[PDB]
Design a protein around this ligand. Structure first.
Ligand SMILES: CC(=O)N[C@@H]1[C@@H](O)[C@H](O)[C@@H](CO)O[C@H]1O
Ligand SMILES: CC(=O)N[C@@H]1[C@@H](O)[C@H](O)[C@@H](CO)O[C@H]1O
Ligand SMILES: CC(=O)N[C@@H]1[C@@H](O)[C@H](O)[C@@H](CO)O[C@H]1O
Ligand SMILES: CC(=O)N[C@@H]1[C@@H](O)[C@H](O)[C@@H](CO)O[C@H]1O
Ligand SMILES: CC(=O)N[C@@H]1[C@@H](O)[C@H](O)[C@@H](CO)O[C@H]1O
Ligand SMILES: CC(=O)N[C@@H]1[C@@H](O)[C@H](O)[C@@H](CO)O[C@H]1O
Ligand SMILES: *[C@@H]1O[C@H](CO)[C@@H](O)[C@H](O)[C@H]1NC(C)=O
Ligand SMILES: *[C@@H]1O[C@H](CO)[C@@H](O)[C@H](O)[C@H]1NC(C)=O
Lengths: 134, 242, 415, 48, 97
């Protein structure tokens, strides 16, 4: 045996022909990308979400090194926060909790407020209440 | 703003509502349908992947669903109540809906009309499907195979079985009203049962008892009107024939 | 025609109802699925039209719907109520369904039995163009909604569902709930301890029923199984050549040049596209199945939980009192508390009573006799009460009603 | 051609199954409410 | 006439070119079978149901001449019962409900 296949008949393992060592193949990191837009009427600032992707391999997704300077924002900046939904760029995590404006996933929501930036936060279920039962 | 109208009279109106419950349970043998008795075709079919494995799985899911549909609407009481031998319901006349023991099957008189309103005459595949079971002259007449793998599974609950549920439901409703559906059946005179049912409409009980005989005649005549609608050329079973 | 059965007892039955609410959210890319990292295949796929946009748009429509489905079912109240620390509900035992902070998760006990009883290379399929978007509301937050719903129900009953929450003792909340069944409040208070014990025992049997091997969560487990096989079948179709020389694009591009590889590569796209089209169409139909269930779940909580529903056999078997929602994987579990009548007794009844040549009818109840003396009693319970002019209303005379019986009606003010 | 014809029929059956199943659920609701009890829902268990 | 066709435009009747007689066509595949069994962890006993198949016609339909003995035992024996849903083999009918 030299090739190992999965249920989809895609080689998930291989043996190096030069040296008889078992070698593993796993598909390269990939995922969808979503954009959080408060609205062209409101502003043009946008936060991009890399769904279910580690933040450590975001800039390698594109050749930003030899691209327009506008595309360098993804290799630097403090607006890089990791979430269960994925890697969020263009928004800053805030300890406070507010009502959901733009749902994201995994219980966090994004909103635009005031210098001016988009905030990613855990959605507030509602006004805390404690019935005066007796 | 200072004038009101109040009824001085009433009419007991009975209306028929028809609702589909289950549809014909059909299963298809994909290998036969697409590659009937052809070994060469069967090999080519496998090259297309497990397409029809889903189709059989999908149709089978529908097939079991129909039995679940019938059960959840009819099999709501696990006690098969029987109507008492004496039909003394304060003048009410239920013979036309209760089962008829004289008939070989337990279907009530109205249920016989309903079964006669739906026909398979305007159907080629289905009508000839049934005749196979009645054919003995033909040699090796395997009609599960003659129709290119198209077969109609029988319902889990046969018509006689379903009729028992309705008879049980009618018996419980007649002799117990609503309690039997909310616990153990509670016997109660039918005159009292309707008096409570009137009390639920906002009309006191004395209305029913003061003219109980009049109400019974109205209901019996009302049941009679359904007979003419169903026993005549008028075909009101459009929601099932379709 | 003159016999009635009036229950002398009752049994508080706590039945459980299970309903799917949402299914796993999935998204599929044509390029990853049909033309995996292949320029030639991708360039040849765009000339098949806007099928792929329909595929992505349809699935996203489902995905957002699943998040929505949970909103109506659970996000019924915008106020998060908290049960008071003191568990004084007239002997009712709620500790085993309210959240218990003695665990890392803020779910409750009956809620935890459910999560362990649903079993979810599963991650391998996620790397073949298939992605599973996480739910908008996580399990911990959904459990907080149910806790808020419970805290309102125990503390405020149905008022919180009709506006501002109104704190009321649970003894009185149940007392009126009997009044809505047609059962006078005195029935509950005279045997409040008995009712609490039955309710406490009833909840316990639910734990034993779920804790055993009797897996009654068929509906929720079916949703996971149905989605799993659909995805498993979908990825499995990538191994079929659909009449092509091979089922892998990379080999074909390596052993054949474009001009004659176009025939082979096109064959796979049609087969793969059709299989993907089958998956979304089947998913769309399933979404309708869940959407109908989600609407039913939302309807049940609106009526069964937030109030008392007169609909028979809608909020549990028997006269429904009130329900408790419980979060479950990909669904919601209701604990309907129903008032089931118990042991009966024979009784001779007459429609009316004739005392001064005038028929007397019961204001609320039925006339019963246990053999020697006539009594007017509750319909759903047996507390015999003397016949009195204040307990009956006269209408007409005695020669019209059939079944009337002579009897003396005690006048409450004569002596 | 035959597979697509068979696939089309199966898909149509699923849609019809949902409509029948939706009707079946309504029938059970009417039986649960109209038959096993008295329903105050106007025009749900008759006319009047 | 030379041959006959059914609704699906498939041959269903034909005349012998030599004697010019009348004869029909009787396809024989027998793919319509079901398997009834409890959980494999519980038992290995299995009952087979043949939808809308006459019990007497099972041996002819199965083409016993090319079947393993494991299937032959399912064509005859004492545990053979006829039902409106078809022929059931491998299950013992019982009066009780
Ligand atoms: C590359 C080299 O210098 N020598 C190779 C060795 O590495 C390999 O293990 C062996 C087996 O084929 O063949 C020779
Ligand atoms: C889900 C996942 O893999 N998250 C990784 C974590 O495992 C790793 O430790 C960290 C940096 O080391 O980056 C992130
Ligand atoms: C700006 C700020 O304070 N951010 C806080 C951080 O300090 C804290 O360590 C973390 C853990 O909850 O939550 C966030
Ligand atoms: C609830 C109850 O006791 N019902 C009884 C029934 O058991 C008995 O067979 C019948 C004969 O008189 O009378 C009534
Ligand atoms: C249901 C049915 O048709 N059963 C048949 C029966 O009619 C026939 O007499 C017998 C003889 O072959 O075989 C069997
Ligand atoms: C073991 C046993 O009682 N088997 C019965 C048989 O006696 C009866 O003649 C037949 C007709 O119903 O049904 C079966
Ligand atoms: C009830 O039925 C019994 C049975 O014979 C009869 O004797 C009695 O007179 C009936 N009473 C009424 C009020 O119908
Ligand atoms: C079911 O299978 C399990 C194996 O996981 C076995 O331990 C158990 O005894 C089996 N039970 C029955 C009733 O077959």
């Amino acid at each position: 045996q030299q090739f190992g296949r999965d249920i989809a008949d895609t080689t998930d393992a291989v043996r190096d022909p030069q040296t008889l060592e078992i070698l593993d193949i796993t598909p390269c990191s990939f995922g969808g990308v979503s954009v959080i837009t408060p609205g062209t009427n409101t502003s043009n600032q946008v936060a991009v979400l890399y769904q279910d992707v580690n933040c450590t391999e975001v800039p390698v997704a594109i050749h930003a090194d030899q691209l327009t300077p506008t595309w360098r924002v993804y290799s630097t900046g403090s607006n890089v926060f990791q979430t269960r939904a994925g890697c969020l760029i263009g928004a800053e995590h805030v300890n406070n909790s507010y009502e959901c404006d733009i749902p994201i996933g995994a219980g966090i929501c994004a909103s635009y407020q005031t210098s001016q930036s988009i905030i990613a936060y855990t959605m507030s279920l509602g006004a805390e209440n404690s019935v005066a039962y007796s | 703003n200072n004038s009101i109208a109040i009824p001085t009279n009433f009419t007991i109106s009975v209306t028929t509502e028809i609702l589909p419950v289950s549809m014909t349970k059909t299963s298809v043998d994909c290998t036969m349908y697409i590659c009937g008795d052809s070994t060469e075709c069967s090999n080519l079919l496998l090259q297309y992947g497990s397409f029809c494995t889903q189709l059989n799985r999908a149709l089978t899911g529908i097939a079991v669903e129909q039995d679940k549909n019938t059960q959840e609407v009819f099999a709501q009481v696990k006690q098969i109540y029987k109507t008492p031998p004496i039909k003394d319901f304060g003048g009410f006349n239920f013979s036309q809906i209760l089962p008829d023991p004289s008939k070989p099957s337990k279907r009530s008189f109205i249920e016989d009309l309903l079964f006669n309103k739906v026909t398979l005459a305007d159907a080629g595949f289905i009508k000839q499907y049934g005749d196979c079971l009645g054919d003995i002259a033909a040699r090796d007449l395997i009609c599960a195979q003659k129709f290119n793998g198209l077969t109609v599974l029988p319902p889990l609950l046969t018509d006689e079985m379903i009729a028992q549920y309705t008879s049980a439901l009618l018996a419980g409703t007649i002799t117990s009203g609503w309690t039997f559906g909310a616990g153990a059946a509670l016997q109660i005179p039918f005159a009292m049962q309707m008096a409570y049912r009137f009390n639920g409409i906002g009309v006191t009980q004395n209305v029913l008892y003061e003219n109980q005989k009049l109400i019974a005649n109205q209901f019996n005549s009302a049941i009679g009107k359904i007979q003419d609608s169903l026993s005549s050329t008028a075909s009101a079973l459009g929601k099932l024939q379709d | 025609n003159n016999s009635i059965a009036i229950p002398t007892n009752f049994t508080i039955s706590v039945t459980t109802e299970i309903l799917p609410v949402s299914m796993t959210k999935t998204s599929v890319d044509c390029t990853m699925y049909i033309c995996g990292d292949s320029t030639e295949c991708s360039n040849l796929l765009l000339q098949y039209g806007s099928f792929c946009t329909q595929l992505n748009r349809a699935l996203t429509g489902i995905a957002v719907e699943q998040d929505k489905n949970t909103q109506e079912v659970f996000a019924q109240v915008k106020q998060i109520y908290k049960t008071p620390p003191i568990k004084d509900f007239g002997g009712f035992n709620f500790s085993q369904i309210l959240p218990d902070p003695s665990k890392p998760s803020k779910r409750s006990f009956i809620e935890d039995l459910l999560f362990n009883k649903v079993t979810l290379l599963i991650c391998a399929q996620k790397f073949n163009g298939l992605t599973v978007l996480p739910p908008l509301l996580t399990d911990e937050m959904i459990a907080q909604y149910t806790s808020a719903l419970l805290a309102g129900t125990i503390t405020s009953g149905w008022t919180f569902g009709a506006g501002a929450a109104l704190q009321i003792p649970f003894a009185m909340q149940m007392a009126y709930r009997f009044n809505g069944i047609g059962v006078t409040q005195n029935v509950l208070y005279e045997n409040q301890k008995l009712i609490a014990n039955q309710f406490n025992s009833a909840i316990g049997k639910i734990q034993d029923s779920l804790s055993s091997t009797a897996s009654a969560l068929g509906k929720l487990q079916d949703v996971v199984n149905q989605n799993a096989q659909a995805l498993n079948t979908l990825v499995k179709q990538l191994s079929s050549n659909f009449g092509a020389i091979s089922s892998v694009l990379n080999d074909i591009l390596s052993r054949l040049d474009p001009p004659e590889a176009e025939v082979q590569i096109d064959r796979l796209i049609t087969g793969r596209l059709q299989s993907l089209q089958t998956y979304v169409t089947q998913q769309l139909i399933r979404a309708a199945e869940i959407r109908a269930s989600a609407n039913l779940a939302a309807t049940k909580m609106s009526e069964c939980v937030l109030g008392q529903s007169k609909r028979v056999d809608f909020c549990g078997k028997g006269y429904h009192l009130m329900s408790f929602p419980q979060s479950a994987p990909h669904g919601v579990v209701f604990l309907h508390v129903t008032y089931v009548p118990a042991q009966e007794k024979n009784f001779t009844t007459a429609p009316a009573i004739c005392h001064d040549g005038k028929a007397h009818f019961p204001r609320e109840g039925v006339f019963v006799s246990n053999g020697t003396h006539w009594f007017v009693t509750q319909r759903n319970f047996y507390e015999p009460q003397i016949i009195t002019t204040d307990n009956t209303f006269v209408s007409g005379n005695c020669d019209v009603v059939i079944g009337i019986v002579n009897n003396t009606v005690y006048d409450p003010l004569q002596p």
